[PDB]
Amino acid sequence: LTFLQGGIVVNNEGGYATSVTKLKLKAEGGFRESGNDTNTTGKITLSGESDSIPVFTLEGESDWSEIELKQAELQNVNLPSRYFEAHAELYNRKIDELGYLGQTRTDGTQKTLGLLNYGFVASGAGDTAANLSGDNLYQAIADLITDQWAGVFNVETYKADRVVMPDTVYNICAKKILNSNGSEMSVLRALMTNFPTVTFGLTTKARDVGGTSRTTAYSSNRRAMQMRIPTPLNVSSVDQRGFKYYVESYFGVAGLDVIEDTAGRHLTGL
Amino acid sequence: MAFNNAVLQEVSDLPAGEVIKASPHNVSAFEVFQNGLIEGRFVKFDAGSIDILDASATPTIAGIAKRKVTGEIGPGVYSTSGIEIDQVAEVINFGFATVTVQDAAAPSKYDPVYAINLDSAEAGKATENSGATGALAVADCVFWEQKAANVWLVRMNKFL
Amino acid sequence: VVMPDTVYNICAKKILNSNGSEMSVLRALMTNFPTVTFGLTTKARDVGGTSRTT
């Protein structure tokens, strides 16, 4: 579960609103050369923009009979405690899945994009990382990182400071030797040396995104992308009806609030 | 303009698309649905999506579009991609639920419900008269009692 | 030295020669020019219609 360790800040802001809207204020204008006693023509004003993200809500359910609870106490399995922990664990896993790939519908189509499958600019690498040379693997990952940096005009706030790649590709990089002619040092050990600010992460979620693996660089800054979980996991008090105990647990979670469009970049195919 | 109907003669009863929870009842969430899905109407299930009744061969009536109390103020409408975005289509498929009826219809208790199957505004409206245009026999559902003006609480014997 | 941020980034990521080490073009410059501090700017991206280092 690497998303919450992926640097993205989580914002529980709009409690039960069905949408979260953010506002941006941009200053426009500039100074003009003026004389000693002249009336300027340099006016500084500002405009703004708005960006909205819908909020959806997930709700799970568990239940147990008293016969169930007492019988399982033979095994030392505490069905209330185990069900609550299953609710919490599934909620954490769901948050990870939502942050990385968003939400997919039960029928199969997908409604909200996450970090991996967002509409960033996506370039396809030469070939698969396994088929790819150590120098060319370094070149692909570094070309991704610096292409994102050029896209953001190298602003420290929006500059990609993290990269997540499938565990297959991350292991390949960590173990692919850059060039045998220099030393045994790996591609990942070269990237971690020439990019001392980018922390390379991994996730199984990236193994197949839209029919092909997907590496992505992004900036883990509040003002670049946030993880909107307006309603953390709320577990209802146990409803006992006769001897049947029943628990619901809902959390209202927006997707990944990608505040700025070109705040991430994709390598499709590696 | 101003508030409609300053003073009403009687307190209006249950609005259409409402489910009584004293009786056994089931409202089931469908995530994909059609934009402009009118609440308080029979809704069909087509191509794996809850959408409005329209002239078809034999639509799969999936129930009654539940009216959201904490929804957007406005016409009873399920919306996608707005400030009033509705994430799922809440559909009442079991129990007693209120559905609009054709203004011509004059039903009564234990009468077999007929939904309207037309590409018009009357889509999904209930009726007793089976000779009404586009009268589709909803399986195992009966009018129970007149709640509001042109709204009847019907009973779905089994799930829809 | 000031170079456009694209050129500075390419300097700081392009390894000098993989056969020698992972040391990048920028690292080689910083080692061979112990007195030169290599900066970057964005306004150097298109001065005069063509990227310019100074």
Partner: peptide
């Protein structure tokens, strides 16, 4: 009919304001 919550209240305009950023 419809609902009870006015549409603009179903949206939480974030208190955090994001200033526009320019090159360094």
């Amino acid at each position: 009919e419809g609902g009870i919550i006015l549409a603009r209240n179903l949206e939480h305009v974030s208190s955090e304001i994001f200033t526009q950023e320019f090159a360094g």
